[model samples]
Target: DGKPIVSVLVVKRPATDKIANMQWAKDLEADCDCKIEWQEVSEDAWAQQKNATLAAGKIADVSLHAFFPANAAQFPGLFEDLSKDLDKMPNVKQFFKEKPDAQKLTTDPEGHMYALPSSRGKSYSGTGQHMFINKTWLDKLGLQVPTTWDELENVLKAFKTEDPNGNGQADEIPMNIRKLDSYFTYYSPMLLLNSTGIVTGFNKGASPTGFYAKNGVVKSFLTSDEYKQVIKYYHKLISEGLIPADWATKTFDACDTDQLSDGKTAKTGVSFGWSQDASFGTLKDQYIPIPVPSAPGVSPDKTVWDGSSAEFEADRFSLSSHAANKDAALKLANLLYSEKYSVQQFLGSFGNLVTDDGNRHYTVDEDKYTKAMGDNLFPGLADRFSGWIPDGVTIKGDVDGDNLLEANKPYEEQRSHFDPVKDYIPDYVNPDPTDSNTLTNNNAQISNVVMQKTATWMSKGGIDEEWDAYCKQLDSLGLQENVKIWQKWYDIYTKK
Candidate 1:
């Protein structure tokens, strides 16, 4: 009864599995000689709640789901400098050794580590957005997957004018874009930017010195000719009614529902998301992932932005600066970072948590597991099949030669903690150290500004004039200053 208890705050969403998982921490509290009290808030209100809590000086002992840019911009003072405490935990040190680059990315400019990253290690390739198209619709229109921008345009036109959905009302949008959601907004700009051979945001220490980088010294995507073409492409899509008219006004859920329920059965031909299954669920059987079409004369390889394979560094967890039991809290967090705890969180305890009822747990059968995990399949698929593991263990194909994922599966199987509907956890990718500073700033500035501008463009409508003016505005808003900061950071990182 006299045991110290830590209060934690987290964002609340419809995702019930996370809520249930937090309850599992209660078991940890007992194990660690501590108690946990969790408070949940809506996503929209998370920022305000966090600020108010911190301002009241009665904040929780720990905060969970603290997004990177927001935390950097708003709540820098609310977090403890975790670097010192993190060094005290052997498991924490091991975590860094396993993923050294991730450790670098998590540390701020002043070398303060603020949060314990949740989820399995990050993916090498950044899984942002992809073009998902209705294969049946394409075949009905006698089209193959388009490889070039012109061909894609023609295909969209056919979908719109020829009743590709077969309902015959010509009601199908050629493409669907979400305007309200920041993820969608940010993703849309990247899709367009990448198609033109411009990888916006952070480039992982890959660019040569003095090159115009978006976030670093490499070429800035917005100022590049590629961006100009991307704007023109958007203008074309808007003019031809290829994109949804209500795109700027649609919520992500509304857009997803439309694509899954309305567009598939009716006439919507294409949409953008992290994955096709991410939107259509198991109905992914009807569609395929098409590489975003390239502009004419651009080599297919160059046109395709071979997404970064390594994960980014930042994550969504925080420790309060004012926690009464800072040492205990750090210990609790370090315990969570351990392999045993990770296995429990991800794979579950076995029989009680997961079941093979419909092959809900681990099976060689990819499709079944994919269906059970809802439309977002890659992370789960990677978890189940890709054989990605933590830094240790003896396994082939793991970054650190450990069969970490495989090692945990059995524990999950025995514990039976799998809840098919709610148990699936997404993988978290950390930023590359070489490009962390540039990437972080770009995320905060250029990337953010472009997204806001794109949303305005989609909603308000204007072509080259609006886009050019927007580019100029971005530069005026210190786009160059942002890039310099990244370059400076990269230089310091390399020097150290």
Candidate 2:
């Protein structure tokens, strides 16, 4: 007890991953006049470990990189609420202002800030999740990339029938998706159909439910005739065998079969998520990230995926209520958000993994970085893990990672095409605070119905047969009430 001890708990990375050493915490420890006690739990099965620690009433002096609502709901008084105290850290105040919407996602419903969150560039890679297609397939089929709804269907048909992979068999899957999950853009389909936001919906919830208001009156798009038109458009492609018949049965592991069970090399013309390496290995580079195909004759909105303006990730650290040394903890916390420290906290500290060039730009020194691996970067360091990398601190424009963004030129080019204000809902504006009972709980059940029915209508062909009753069914399933809650949150957020 000679000096204040800040017991900081964090999730540890695997042993081999390289980064700066723990010595950097010594710098912070000396300045804050505190003894740092560093503790870590392996990331595998970690949330349980952290949650268990909190449940047993053994919360650390600070929790590192814990994410939203869960930790807050799990242990209400376990950590300090930094909403008002953020003003004490002037740097975080400005950081909050620059990315206000994104920052808002980190704050709880009543305005308590539980954990510090990670922010990223407005044009960062996360929102870059788009459908990638095999460019060679298009060229071999003598087809142009689809620009309209009709055009996409034909191209996908060609992928199915034309043997674009140069095999003698007719074994090409036009689109590959693991499930009807929300991460793929179609759930934001309202954005593409009306170009509202993204295919997944305006904010976050189930993949199948999206509500957009018109004339100050909210309505569920899932129940709309317009969404039916969009569904019909996709139904055409699916019914024609352009997409896999058993798409719902698809799994991530299936992508590894470089050759299908029929012995033809996998020639999936369109697939979701990042790149070829991520989608299918040898199938990599065969596919090019295409603009998410648009609905035809809707005044031509050409933008693709939208970024979440809030960059709040689960990686930011927070101070604890049990610290007892409020002065030292506050000082330590403030130092992390400072532009200077946050930079090193994200990328490693300047000497070993990074260095400042004469031109005033920081660059990764590949050779020195080789030695700056894992906890080796800052051995025995606690209470000083991350510096809360801000949204605007991009790697120098001219600088490329050792992997070189050039490896995926088409994806990078496509990412630059986004104008966030046009495409993305700012995090603050997104409806995060919901009445968990009425709005949140109802969505999954309702969306499950929409997912199966949409797949049913497409696979079994029943839209025109039951589209009207489907609308009635949706309203009965609490779609209107869902819209009500979203509008309620939206109005409150805008006014705030």
Candidate 3:
């Protein structure tokens, strides 16, 4: 009866079947000397329940993996203004002091902090959209890996015509891109835009919103000359049978299987994805990561990528304004940011997924880890809610761990090619609630226009003639206002 009680809500999945009963979470209650009321919402139901619970003004003291929107106006008074009581969270205070930019991400324009950050400080964070090529195919065709757009074109032509897979049939897909939907544009030809010194694609987080900062001014690359070049080149690929004209219609799973094997051996000559194993499966060994080829007259050094290097997804954990025991909730929140708790939050409890060797030296329990795969794997693959990999921690043979050493080889080679400042929007930059609403309203139409026009141009051959009209159409669809809103916020974010 003496101990304070705090209710906590978290999304439920196989990896987190009974988090309240987990030793790490239990340990938090012991350390804080408080009682925790646990509520688990199924992953499928969380979306609908989140809205209903918040609107009903009935929320837990602490909500983990809570993704409250950056547009605070949508859910006003639902979350606590954490800045009002920063002194109550010493660990969090220190974290913000150490990484000011991360603090900036958590804090809104009015200096109100609604949530804590889920920060990732791993090498895998260093880049996005690594392009892979079938090295075996290149060797079979008696060709070298390409470093320029021209060379890549030639290689793709050979792959298409020469039957590089050796199946003796015309089934090889020289370039395999997934659907051309604006929202799912990761594997699209937009990635190749990086080769031309234009950082408007999946690589740039802000690109999908149809705006990016260039030389201190927010501009739309969708209508730029460089954009036209990429569309024209993609058109050439589609027309020449290098890239299939119907590439945009297939689902992701179907595309993955197509890349894995074409009812024979691997039929994909080129692909872009997170890893080779996931995309190529049994043929992963034959594929290797490659630097994106440079467009004509563009140096490879000029290319840029979203090397997230140190990314923080804001608003993962938040306290509700309706919390009965705010101090206990803050204690739980602050404890989550600690090295010990953070690691446990990322993986499972120490005894299950990780273990302490001695004197704070931790090592992953490989046996338990392997058992935790598939449906049983832990949450927070990239979104480790509020903690760094503490000192003296050793993890071996994990998928992401291996990816850093091996999968990131091509990224390491191209590290100098990245202009982190230009290629990425700083974590500190975000639109105000009003501007965010503006962004929300305009991004839909802007993205639709970009996707539709580009898909048509890539499949057909009319980009050159229709380019000017497309640009004008985007302008009419509030693209200019979108640029202006971003510039307003970006300018404010830059000020001392």
Candidate 4:
């Protein structure tokens, strides 16, 4: 117990208190031989508190789950340059070697590594949002699973008109697109844009902020003919009463509640969620993940569901420049980066929540798992301090991981339906911190216009009439300049 004391500050949810109470934290202390004086702050309070801490000119030995740009941009010397101490942190160095894209994301354009990006590894990460349809409804109506946009429309009409729920009422929503800002923007009828040969939806891959690089030139798909078609299609569905009239305006809770079953029947037929269970509560078993329906102009083979590349959440973990004991701090970090401990940090201490086979492969003890440890409830970074599960290490029985794997199975099985190049673009683009204000403002303005106009067109049907003016409006708002900035960084990072 005479180990070096390393004070660690972490941004945590409201419910989390002391990290000392966590079994994993105690085990980490033993493993790294460091006494961590854990300091906890709620996420809501961290912004102001983090700034104040920096103003005092001293910080803890390490910071976990604290975003860097907001802190470091204002207070330059708050965090350590991780690259300067990489020799003392062998596990972090090895992680970067194993995943170079992660390195690119963690290291700034100026070549200083101030933070580590969070990753659950490729196997457990980067599954895009899913679209689920009621398989039971399809069977009840004696219809086949839709494979094209037109066929989907037919199925929707049946769901709305045919009383597929057998309650002899018109309560079925047929197609539910809701919470435009929260959920729909991520996976909307924009998903149909994929059928019309666009790759913006489902994952936001290459077109993350409404702009993407095409053959080394930046472009805006928001102003494209394909996007217009997507909007037009949504208009048709709404006009025909397939989708709800207030779909774009409803809250996520409202939308989610409407999709759930009334003891015997689900009120929604087609819906979007991170998973089937996530979309339809008790009625999840009635639904199945289907191939995205294609449009006429694009070949079925050309149709794709956007897939995700490795996801590395930036600024999740960092060392402090004013650390009292740098080696002790990094020793704990290195231990967390190790495969066995990474899983333990994510779930809980190994013997309590996870168990290992004779060969060292790990499995979560489903009975032992609780929200206190499972759902980002504890004072720990979700994906940071981890790389691909180390060689010979395997994991199973993780409930959420199992659900995500099941949700994305159809897309993986029919891989040919995806554009090998476009659908799975590596999200290796991180806007420079200096221009983040401009990029954030420009992207927000563009997205506002795009989503507002899209909702308007879908609800009222006037896209063609305003199409020309919309293009000019976007240009006047500096959409071109936004694209140029992204292009500049895109070239710089890709070259690196």
Candidate 5:
């Protein structure tokens, strides 16, 4: 009765899902002499239900990963102003001090930062993806990892001609493509250029528009010469039987190329992926992560790949105007950011996800975590469920686990090598307040033309035959207006 109990609202992932190792969380409350009562709602029903909750004024003391900025505007005095009170929360203050962009993003026109932004290490990671190749086949073929564009093409030829799978069959398909829509079009076509622009994660958003910026000026990667080279290069490969035949749609197992990690299905020489282990199931170790190969006649940078954050913004986790304990809840909120608690909240505590190896530094038992939580849940649940993203906490993960290969070395190297044609910010500029309609119309007409032309080219061939006509078509469809709308938002985002 003496201690305060904070009612925290959450939206469950599987709806009926409770915290896996909640016993530790309960013990922490005993230590802090406060009860953090968590109540969950349906994630699918959250948007509709949250508005009702806010309107009804029956919300809990706190709600995590709940709403957007526009949602907050609906309920005036619904959120506690942390701007003045932040002085008491040193860690939160220090966090914003280090990350000014976060400060700008969270703050409103009235200067009150209503919500806390969520941040993670490497965002998603330093780089989006790298070419995962079958090292077992490479070793058997007696070949070295390709460095240059020429070396890559030569290696593909050897992979096609020479039987590397130790079987008498010439079944080794060098590079495979399953889908024609996303990564298939983006990551699959590195044969043409040395720029990470080929694999840029920039989403013009309305139409999956990809771009590159030079000294602050932006242009569409879709209509660029680098993109042109991709079409032509892939054309040569498809027509010459160098690439998978059904690459325009699916990567069928019937093609003698399956992703068999245990060497069960046959030879799949290469595929686009974030990890070697993920690409090949049982034979993860047989796969090796090579740098992005140089494009023909283009040289200099070693394996250029696009890099960006997983999610680089503040998410809502604020006290309601009807909060029973505003100051205490806020204290607990800030306490969640502390080193010991952040680790506990992120990786499970009670010596579960991570066992304390004596002095502050703990070792993460990947298998224990995977088992305790579901198959793929752990520290990530903090960010995914509650927006408790411990941005700068540096806990070293040991690579000494069984059924594991490398820790973060592969992703680490990719981030370092990344000189992507563009990062997340510039290309994904916010459309102006009044330009949503214009963007809709533009993408409506433009995206179809772009996607159809590219898919058709992959299926048949004609990129060079109608290069001038293609560029002219995009301009005729309000391409200039697209850039202008994007530029204004980008400028605003950068200046602020």
Candidate 6:
């Protein structure tokens, strides 16, 4: 009893690789001096599982890999204040100075740190959404890469009307968007809005000022003029047959395979997501990443919609509040944060978990990694080990042709890789530590809210009339209040 023994509970999605990893963790419990337990929750039932665990007080010493309760509103009491422990941890000082915004996001209004973020110190290389075009179709149509918004529209129109797929049937879809997924699938509208000097979407309540934030109040993208224009532009695309009719209802895979694949519909001219590789596999050479067009009549120089590179520190983790051994829990948490432990958890004990070739980057080979660990395993790994570990050791190798090795790389090399191809926006070309607040705020308000609202509007098919109504709804939902809180905290943190 004198020596603390931490008991940790993890809510896991069922899959073999994750089960294996859990087993690995269990196997290493004796080594780590902690008692670990795993509970399998079906992906569909994660919400129920989490609620039950929280409701049943003292269920586990810590909860691992839970992403719900993103805001302060959800599960306020379920987490313990980690501020004291965080301040005491040397690693927090060692690894976290560059990403000061993370501290702000992780702390509540009372300055209590609850969640220890997973992906801190990473750059905003790009989101998953990039325009994936058919090179063969473009060549067949003798079209060049479209750099501007109008050019992109013309290209889509040509694909639709000119039979760029060359099937001799009017079946080619010029553009295809998704309804099921938002992060990557909603790129069409997002790109349009961004190009037009308007950004829309959920901004993580992390920034304090701008149009998104007024008088230190953060506002939702739903109310922004940019958001309305995004919807209107897309509506025009939909009406003109530039976007596929089934886009509003299509699943992500359906859009990728049916539209972008070589044979299926063979009609899809443009698609967007995390990687162009998903569409063409080895045929990734067939597509080039292009910047999305600006909205009509919008200035071209306006760099309005760049996403954030400010690494976040507010993610899920287990704390010692309910632990029988608080010291042990802290030690275990510290060990998990260590570079050696993180490399093992992320890249496996060896570099076997990732596809590490000498010349290849540590780009996540989804299929290989998934097969080794299961589809859900990577998310858990990313959550637990991403920022805590040394990036080069944790990932395979530098795939971006950087030619850098683990020990000889810059500090940025230690950060997680955002998809560069998807980051075609000019503003995101380099790491801008100076603009961290603007980027983070934009992400919360314009990127997050617009994407959420766009999906909802597209699915319902009456966005025109509902656009104003939706803006009002977002305001009622405290989006503005959330923005203000975020901005206030950010301003104070940055000044400090």
Candidate 3 runs further than 4 Å off: 12-16, 69-73, 200-204, 262-264, 309-311, 359-361, 375-386, 391-394, 412-415
lDDT, each prediction? 0.54, 0.57, 0.72, 0.71, 0.59, 0.51
- Which scores better on lDDT, 1 or 3? 3
Model 1 residue 412 CA deviation in Å: 30
Report RMSD (Å) for each prediction in the order shown. Answer: 9.6, 5.3, 2.8, 3.2, 5.1, 7.8
Q: Which stretches of candidate 6 lie over 4 Å from their true place?
A: 1-4, 13-28, 40-43, 67-78, 120-125, 180-188, 200-217, 260-266, 309-313, 351-370, 373-387, 391-394, 397-496
TM-score of every candidate relative to the true structure? 0.72, 0.77, 0.90, 0.89, 0.76, 0.72
Model 6, C-alpha of 169: deviation from truth (Å): 3.0
Alpha carbon RMSD to native, model 5: 5.1
Off-target runs (Cα >4 Å) in candidate 2 are 12-32, 42-58, 69-76, 108-111, 122-126, 182-219, 255-266, 275-277, 280-284, 302-310, 349-352, 358-360, 365-425, 429-434, 466-470
**Clash statistics: count for each candidate:** 36, 28, 1, 0, 8, 28
Best by TM-score, which number?
Answer: 3
Runs in model 1 deviating more than 4 A are 17-23, 67-78, 121-126, 180-186, 201-216, 262-266, 306-317, 347-350, 355-473, 494-496
lDDT (Cα, tens digit) per residue for candidate 3, span 243-345: 8778767788888888888434888899888778777777888899888888887876776543444345675678888788899988887888777787777
- Score residue 207 of candidate 2 by CA lDDT: 29
The per-residue C-alpha lDDT of model 4 at residue 208 equals 52
lDDT of 1 by residue, 1-496 (tens): 7778788675543223444343345556766787777676666787566556656656578765544533543556767777877665677677677766556655754576776544345332343445678898888878998878898899989988988766668778788876643233434534655566554332223221112333223244556667567666776787788887667777767877877774337445887655555567546667766666778667665554423223443544567777888777777776666654553444333232322333222213334333434533212112211012363322222221122222222222212322211111111222334445555555456556666666655545564577677778877766676556545544455434
For model 2, residues 278-324, the per-residue Cα lDDT tens digits are: 45554565666666555654433433443322224544667777778
Model 1, 41: alpha-carbon shift in Å? 3.6
